[PDB]
């Protein structure tokens, strides 16, 4: 009767929150492209079909995306395989020579400025005796003057000699299905109304995530994971001034970034088997690379996000925007990649409005930089090689990363300003549905049976 | 009433269900527990962590009276200071996740009780075997 006895139960559904190393699942269709034209296509695992997304009825679960893990590991290893895709490539040491640069041959108007400098120098051939005298073209954001005459040098020649990039690899994002090891599940919040934290009363268990594309944009998140119904915003303390406002809107915004210089390449021989690709002539005219968005789309989307911001800050609140007051060139700008070249645009015709509770396109003048110090590491940069022909791309702006302006008065306006900051928060726009649990079987419960002897 | 609703009798299937329906299929969480040049050593150290945490529960189960039975009675009575709940509820009212919160203080008392209740039954079996 009341003599209840302990009975253990092995293989019992319970889990605890934990954190262990997850792994890839590259799509098997992406295995046809030979020997790492993108990072992690031969290195890690071919995926599975139909991952067992299985419902968990009568289950609520306290998710989190700010104290979440697995966005630190994905940023960690994506840093690591970014260095893995740079260890085979050729070091670009012998370019640190005192340049001599003039204006490029162009119809120089005083309003426009010379973006590209000529920079003819000396450089050793594969023979140690001879030294060819070669010329190139270089952007103004890559040379500084050593101080008549006018002679420059590379900007990164101080403190960081850094490699070229092998034209076999490609900087496109491929989908990545992260999978848990044995004994660990991946909870996916299926709630169609779900901000950052909070119990998600409709979960489902998977083993491998959907295909994540790793992109690198500071402002204007691109090409991934649009929202379902509304424009969903999510943050930490919305009464904090240091926490970004990860905007995620519902309909995509089409961008039309291009580069209209032809920009012919040529191969200079550095040494034994060390080619260096430098931009030779530019065919046509020297015109500015730009991007386009639809003004009818952009103003309606700001009409959406000014409604959802008033959902958190009340009505009759005069929401206005401004243009990210200061910072470096990689935080004040919409810094991104397009086809293998690095556009730095100027979102200041965008983030300039004011909203009260009562066909043409917007053109963004971008600019290109060839050495690259993505993630702002100490002793790295990255000489992106030039690319042939006119360059043009089309992408979907999916989410913003806003930042409030830390007022301290009883005003109504809230001059919001965009700001990227840490790149992990981009991937928090991809890893908010998923938490990783550890299956912990072998529970124990009393019932009325005894081990007979 | 025709009962056409879909049911997913798969991994972690009854994870919200009652004890009388969760103990129907315990093997499904059991069997999906072992199977399923620098990112290969994360496979090595993920595998030998999986087989390690498999061996740890298979050792703690092994050194009790439950070799591979996966469900087994014991001889220790159930002190009501642990749970103080009725019996007629806790097999059809609550759920297993409610149990792990309801007992987690009282674990490491039960695991300590199990070792003497096994080794005492073990040596009493030897004292029974020695006389014959």
């Amino acid at each position: 009767a009341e003599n209840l006895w302990v009975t253990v139960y092995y293989g019992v559904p319970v889990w605890k929150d934990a954190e262990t190393t997850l792994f890839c699942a590259s799509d098997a269709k992406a295995y046809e492209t030979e020997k790492h034209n993108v990072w992690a296509t031969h290195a890690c695992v071919p995926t599975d079909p139909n991952p067992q997304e299985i419902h968990l009825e009568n289950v609520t679960e306290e998710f989190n995306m700010w104290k979440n893990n697995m966005v630190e590991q994905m940023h960690t290893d994506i840093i690591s395989l970014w260095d893995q895709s740079l260890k085979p490539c050729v070091k670009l040491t012998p370019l640190c020579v005192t340049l001599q640069c003039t204006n490029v041959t162009n119809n120089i108007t005083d309003d426009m400025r010379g973006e590209l400098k000529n920079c003819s120098f000396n450089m050793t051939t594969e023979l140690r005796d001879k030294k060819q005298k070669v010329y190139s073209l270089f952007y103004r954001l890559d040379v500084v003057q050593i101080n008549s005459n006018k002679e420059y040098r590379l900007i990164n020649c101080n403190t960081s000699a850094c490699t070229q990039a092998c034209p076999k690899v490609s900087f496109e994002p491929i989908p990545i299905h992260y999978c848990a090891p044995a004994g660990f599940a991946i909870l996916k919040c299926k709630d169609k109304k779900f901000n950052g934290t909070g119990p998600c009363p409709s979960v489902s268990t998977v083993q491998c995530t959907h295909g994540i594309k790793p992109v690198v944009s500071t402002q204007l998140l691109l090409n991934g994971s649009l929202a379902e119904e509304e424009v969903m915003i999510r943050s930490e303390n919305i009464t904090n001034n240091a926490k970004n406002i990860l905007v995620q809107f519902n309909t995509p915004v089409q961008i039309n970034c291009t580069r209209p210089n032809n920009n012919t390449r040529k191969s200079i021989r550095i040494g034994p088997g060390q080619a260096f690709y430098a931009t030779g002539d530019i065919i046509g005219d020297i015109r500015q690379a730009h991007c386009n968005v639809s003004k009818a789309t952009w103003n309606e989307t700001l009409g959406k996000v000014v409604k959802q911001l008033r959902k958190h800050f009340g009505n009759n609140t005069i929401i206005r925007f401004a243009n990210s007051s200061g910072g470096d060139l990689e935080v004040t700008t919409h810094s991104f990649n397009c086809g293998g070249e690095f556009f730095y645009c100027n979102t200041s015709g965008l983030f300039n409005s004011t909203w009260i509770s009562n066909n043409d396109s917007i053109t963004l003048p971008c600019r290109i930089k060839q050495i690259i110090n993505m993630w702002q590491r100490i002793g790295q940069c990255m000489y992106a090689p030039p690319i042939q022909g006119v360059i043009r791309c089309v992408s979907n702006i999916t989410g913003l990363i806003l930042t409030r302006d830390g007022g301290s008065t009883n005003s109504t306006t809230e001059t919001f300003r965009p700001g990227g900051g840490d790149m992990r928060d981009n991937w928090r726009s991809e890893l908010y549905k998923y938490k990783v649990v550890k299956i912990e079987p072998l529970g124990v419960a009393p019932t009325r049976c005894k081990r007979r002897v | 009433a025709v009962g056409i609703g879909a049911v997913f009798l798969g991994f972690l299937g009854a994870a919200g269900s009652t004890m009388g329906a969760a103990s129907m299929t315990l093997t499904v969480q059991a069997r999906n527990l072992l199977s399923g040049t620098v990112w290969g050593i994360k496979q090595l150290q993920a595998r030998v962590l999986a087989v390690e945490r498999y061996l740890r529960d298979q050792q703690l189960l092994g050194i009790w009276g439950c070799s591979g039975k996966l469900i087994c009675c014991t001889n220790v009575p159930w002190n009501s200071s642990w749970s103080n709940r009725n019996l007629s509820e806790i097999w059809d009212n609550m759920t297993w996740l409610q149990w792990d919160k309801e007992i987690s203080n009282y674990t490491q008392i039960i695991y300590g009780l199990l070792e003497e209740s096994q080794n005492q039954q073990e040596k009493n079996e030897q004292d029974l075997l020695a006389l014959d």
């Epitope: - | 025709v2 009962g3 879909a6």
Partner: antibody
Framework: EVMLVESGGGLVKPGGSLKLSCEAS????????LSWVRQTPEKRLEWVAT??????????YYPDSVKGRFTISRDNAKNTLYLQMSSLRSEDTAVFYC??????????????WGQGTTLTVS | DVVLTQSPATLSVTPGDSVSLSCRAS??????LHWYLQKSHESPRLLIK???QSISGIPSRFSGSGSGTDFTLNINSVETEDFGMYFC?????????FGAGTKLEL
């Protein structure tokens, strides 16, 4: 998302045969029960056939007006539902929808409907 | 077979008004009753599950009630997008059957 896309509809002479297909994606196909329901030119909805899901028993069900004539089947590996119709009648003329049921106890309802494919028997 | 009788067959209401749609079963289908909206040129869309259960993504203005044989679908401020053909459906017995629908026009 859950998608059911039917094909195979057409104009059939009476007495003929026709196999409809429904191609599904976005869910664990075998677990859900699936049905064909038709909508007549007067817009009335008539259930046509059901095949239960893997955890439902996987049997087939038909109303008397089609029994012995219509056959519902599934190919779970390709996530496709089929309806093989024989001894067709002019009354079979309708838009045929593939439909997916819900989950658990409160899931015998139709949860998702396809776009439909048209069958005309005359 | 279970005959489901929806009343009225057609109903005209101004957007913003509220409506009560009737479905009556020939046998008890106590909670076996679902409501679907089929707009013109579209597939039907589930409004209410098991007499009264609301559906994620369906506006809160859709509500269901009723038990046994007599059922009611309330729409408590009808919007322009709500106009269409309304079906009730039973799962109490084979064969599965629908009501004839209420057509709500503007």
């Amino acid at each position: 998302e859950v998608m059911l896309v039917e094909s195979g509809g057409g104009l059939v002479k009476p007495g003929g045969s026709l196999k409809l297909s429904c191609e599904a994606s976005g869910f664990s196909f075998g677990f859900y029960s699936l049905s064909w329901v038709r909508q007549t030119p007067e817009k009335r909805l008539e259930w046509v056939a059901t095949i239960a899901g893997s955890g439902v028993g996987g049997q087939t069900y038909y109303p008397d007006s089609v029994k012995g004539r219509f056959t519902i089947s599934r190919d779970n590996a390709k996530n496709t539902l089929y309806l093989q119709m024989s001894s067709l009648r002019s009354e079979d003329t309708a838009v045929f929808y593939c439909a997916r049921h819900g989950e658990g106890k409160y899931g015998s309802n139709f949860a998702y409907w396809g776009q439909g494919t048209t069958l005309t028997v005359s | 077979d279970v005959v489901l009788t929806q009343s009225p067959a057609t109903l005209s209401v101004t957007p913003g008004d509220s409506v009560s749609l009737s479905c009556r079963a020939s046998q008890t289908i106590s909670d076996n009753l679902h409501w679907y909206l089929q707009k013109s040129h579209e597939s039907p869309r589930l409004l209410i599950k098991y007499s009264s259960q609301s559906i994620s993504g369906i506006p809160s203005r859709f509500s269901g009630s009723g038990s046994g044989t007599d059922f009611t679908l309330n729409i408590n401020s009808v919007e322009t997008e709500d106009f269409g053909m309304y079906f009730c459906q039973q799962t109490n017995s084979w064969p599965l059957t629908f009501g004839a629908g209420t057509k709500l026009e503007l």
